[PDB]
RNA sequence: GAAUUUGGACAAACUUGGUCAUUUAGAGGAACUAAAAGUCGUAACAAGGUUUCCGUAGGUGAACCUGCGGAAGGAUCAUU
RNA sequence: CCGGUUGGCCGGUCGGAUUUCCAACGGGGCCUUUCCUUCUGGCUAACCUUGAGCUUGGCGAACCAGGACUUUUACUUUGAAAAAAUUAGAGUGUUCAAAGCAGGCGUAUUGCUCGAAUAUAUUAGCAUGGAAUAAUAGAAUAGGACGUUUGGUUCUAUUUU
RNA sequence: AUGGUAGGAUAGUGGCCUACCAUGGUUUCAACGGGUAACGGGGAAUAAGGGUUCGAUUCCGGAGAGGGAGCCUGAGAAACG
């Protein structure tokens, strides 16, 4: 959020093409489009000015299969953040319950900032990495 | 409360005392441990072949005056030595040496028997005839 | 500490009925308690109680008549599906004829027979005979 | 591993085909064709054990290779053809027509329909998209293509095929008040009218359906296919019409005729 | 071979993985490219299902696409001056996507006169009309215009030359231009 | 287009070590159990003839003995 | 207020059931301070209407469609999608039975015909009704909810001139 | 090793591999190690209810062809008649 720039490569949305031309107002075409099944594309993906080749709002993946909730309990990768899925897991013989969890890696895209304690809801992707397969759709605590 | 835990979260709790508590017991611990497949002269097996090395004259404990007549013999599979019991009347005029006997255990799962001090197998077959067939002469044995 | 309000009562109406006494003060008078007493005085085990409101909690008199052999609790809760009431009643009941199971289901409080009226399951929360 | 599959053992076959767990240690196994191996009757399944016109599989091999039975108009001397839902069967020697519909039981029903009936079937649409040159087609739920299609047919209507030319001849779209036949699931082989369908983004649209003696039922959309509008059927129906009689009136029925 | 499975890795925990199985054929991996400049020598790779896959070895021409005039020519390739990788596929010059190249720009100086007639750096009636008509289009940029009087232009490469056999790219631009040549000229 | 040949990745294996998970021999010890008409005493059981037991330290042919603090499972429920 | 099941009713045929009916159990609609959210259209559902008692001109789920705002769970009900074999189980005299999925009935010559049920199958995922019981959130240096206001910044963008 | 950016390779996604960069990732809710006389499941035996023990073996999935590694052909093999 103070350059874009920072690779070596130029990063670009790819086949978005803007010519050197023309000259009008809204300066860079920028691809953008809605993830469905009802979030919302935030406002931060429409005007913003990251890359991102991984999000699921101007990046190249889709969302499709499982829509996950969980608490963010580690933001100390680059874009990419640990939450924590906590379920209760029935035994038959004692006829109760125990407390378990998973740890899920998950992708943050820059138009969402999250901390640590926020509850996200993440949907899943094609395999981001050797770990994430699931991308961040809307961050609503805090 | 009843000492054990009761909420309806603590199955984790219940679930780890009992396994250790079930260390506790004689039959769940030889089986996990693996005694008889480690500790054992038959190494888990029901029946055994071996080879007779010597007679021999075991006197009974007490109050039981008697001779008991087991003999030695060093197993096939193993090369263990194991003392075993002859079991009737007259019956170890068959099993004189260097033969191949079968052993069976005494049903005490382990234990000596009775007032035999020591011995934990019994003879079954000598030279491939059933021992009871040579004591009821139904059959009679090989020359060796 | 006090975990369970309606286990005490429970406890204390047991203990006035092997006594003999007609008569009983439960402190400290939850909404449970009111509604598995509204149970147990339908079909006919305690008679009228009072309510008696103190700031704090509220305190109860409940009159017993002889009835009641032993009104007990189930804690925890358990959650409990259709074929589980019946294991349950055949477990906990001394017969299949009288005795009820008080369970909390989603359409209130009641025993075992009306849930089964109803086709409703939920939590058991104690037992009356 | 390391390819396909080319055996089927019995026990493993589908339990619609009715086939009788001893006399053998294999089942014929489909071979690729318009229907899923699940969804499917081989013909030899079909002509030896439905029909009784033959005892082996080489009394059926014998009858196929005379070009005898054909089905939907085109010849198939193949042993283990899937016939799937909807096709037609001709055996010319004895001039006899099957449709290849269920019964309530959930398996496949000899269905002997007239001669004006065999020239046609219907068939759900399975998708609907641009091919090369941007010419449009759809698919059909047995994998007929179909080119040039009118541009109201959109996914799960049916189309009247006419199995001379593969043209399509008329159609039913899809809402509330259709005759719908269930293939797939618990409730396959019922015939109910649609009550309303469920939108359900993100995967498993379900559909609720009542039948004749209103009792209501719910199924996914994968296993409806609309058959025409309340009254008449654009088919002939099965004996039954597809009601679900209980196990308790099934046997008062059968005390009934006895 | 080269394997390209994952059981071979730690989990993520970090635990070492047993062996649960031999390499398999439908998870292999081939050796690279390193597509070299002159000469052009294709091989090609069978792959899974048949479908030929070309490896370009030492190409020598590509096809390169101007963007802003919506063209494309087939020009000569002079060296590669850039690559965001690895600084010896630079000294080595080898050809892969997104390196940085100079193409030889003389048949688009040769399409820019016969379309625009003004000539880049420093005779009919119908030729008259239509340079006359596409009037002020004829002002493509400095930066570009400086490389035509210099003879070599600014290519990046667009198409993946291991796999498809050929070289294509794409004449450098605008800001993207601007950000490499800050990368170039830095000392 | 054959032999041959350069670099590379994959990599079976080989030679020299070094760790650990496994066996054998083994001078000697060092105990424990069972069975044993052995030897010397009599530590405990009665106030067992010095009440017994605990922890700790030292000593002694063997039980054990002695110091210090504790217990009653004591031989005292007891002196307005 | 209203219908839903089990009754009950002249035992109507001498163990069949036309409901004016008592009773018990289980739902729904409305009012009582009771928001248990509704921005655009066709269609109007009830419907203003209404013909002398089938008429021409009122409230959108009553029927859908389009977008927009959504405290979060655990629990329980119903259902979908869960491979056969095996388990439980229905029908059928393998001569009985273990089995098997066969078989039965005629003028047995042209034949006719009933079947191959059903239930169980956890935990997880999925759809749905309930909302008791356990949790979770919210308006407190108001930054709160409203709002026909009275406005100002700022962003799209149609049909049109 | 966990992630980022580019490439390479692949049928394709991905530290799958390379170059550069950052310092991450798992764990008492039992990670990592060790043991298994451990192929997994449908299932079996014995049980009032709850359970306990077994499942190499008629079906489904996996793996292997004395041990390892490499490859040709082909749609499909890291194939062992
Ligand atoms: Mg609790
Ligand atoms: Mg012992
Ligand atoms: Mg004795
Ligand atoms: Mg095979
Ligand atoms: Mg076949
Ligand atoms: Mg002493
Ligand atoms: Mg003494
Ligand atoms: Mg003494
Ligand atoms: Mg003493
Ligand atoms: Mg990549
Ligand atoms: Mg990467
Ligand atoms: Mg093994
Ligand atoms: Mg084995
Ligand atoms: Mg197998
Ligand atoms: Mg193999
Ligand atoms: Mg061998
Ligand atoms: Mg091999
Ligand atoms: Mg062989």
Known sequence: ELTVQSERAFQKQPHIFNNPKVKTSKRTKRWYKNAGLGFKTPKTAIEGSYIDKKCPFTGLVSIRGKILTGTVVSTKMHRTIVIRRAYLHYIPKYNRYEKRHKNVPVHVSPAFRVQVGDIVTVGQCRPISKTVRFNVVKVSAA | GKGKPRGLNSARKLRVHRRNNRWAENNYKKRLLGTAFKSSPFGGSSHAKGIVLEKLGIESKQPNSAIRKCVRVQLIKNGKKVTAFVPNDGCLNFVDENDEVLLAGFGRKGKAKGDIPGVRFKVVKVSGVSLLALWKEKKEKPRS | ?129 | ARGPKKHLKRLAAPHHWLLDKLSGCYAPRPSAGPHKLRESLPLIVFLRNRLKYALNGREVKAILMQRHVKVDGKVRTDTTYPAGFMDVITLDATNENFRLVYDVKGRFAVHRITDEEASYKLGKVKKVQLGKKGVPYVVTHDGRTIRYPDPNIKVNDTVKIDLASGKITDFIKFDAGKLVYVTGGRNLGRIGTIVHKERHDGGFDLVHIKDSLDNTFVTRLNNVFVIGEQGKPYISLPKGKGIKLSIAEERDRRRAQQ | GISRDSRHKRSATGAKRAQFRKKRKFELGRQPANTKIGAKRIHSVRTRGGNKKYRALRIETGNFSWASEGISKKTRIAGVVYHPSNNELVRTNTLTKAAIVQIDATPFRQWFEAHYGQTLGKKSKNAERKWAARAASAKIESSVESQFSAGRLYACISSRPGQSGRCDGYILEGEELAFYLRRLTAK
């Open chain 3, 1 to 129: 500490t006090r975990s369970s309000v309606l286990a005490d009562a429970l406890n204390a109406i047991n203990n006035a009925e092997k006594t003999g006494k007609r008569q009983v003060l439960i402190r400290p008078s939850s909404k449970v308690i009111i509604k598995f007493l509204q149970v147990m005085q339908k079909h006919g085990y305690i008679g009228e109680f009072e309510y008696i409101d103190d700031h704090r909690s509220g305190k109860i008199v409940v009159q017993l008549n002889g009835r009641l052999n032993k009104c007990g609790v189930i804690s925890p809760r358990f959650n409990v599906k259709i074929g589980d009431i019946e294991k349950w009643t055949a477990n906990l009941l001394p017969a299949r004829q009288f005795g009820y199971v008080i369970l909390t289901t989603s359409a209130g409080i009641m025993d075992h027979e009306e849930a089964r009226r109803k086709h409703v399951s939920g939590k058991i929360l104690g037992f009356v005979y």
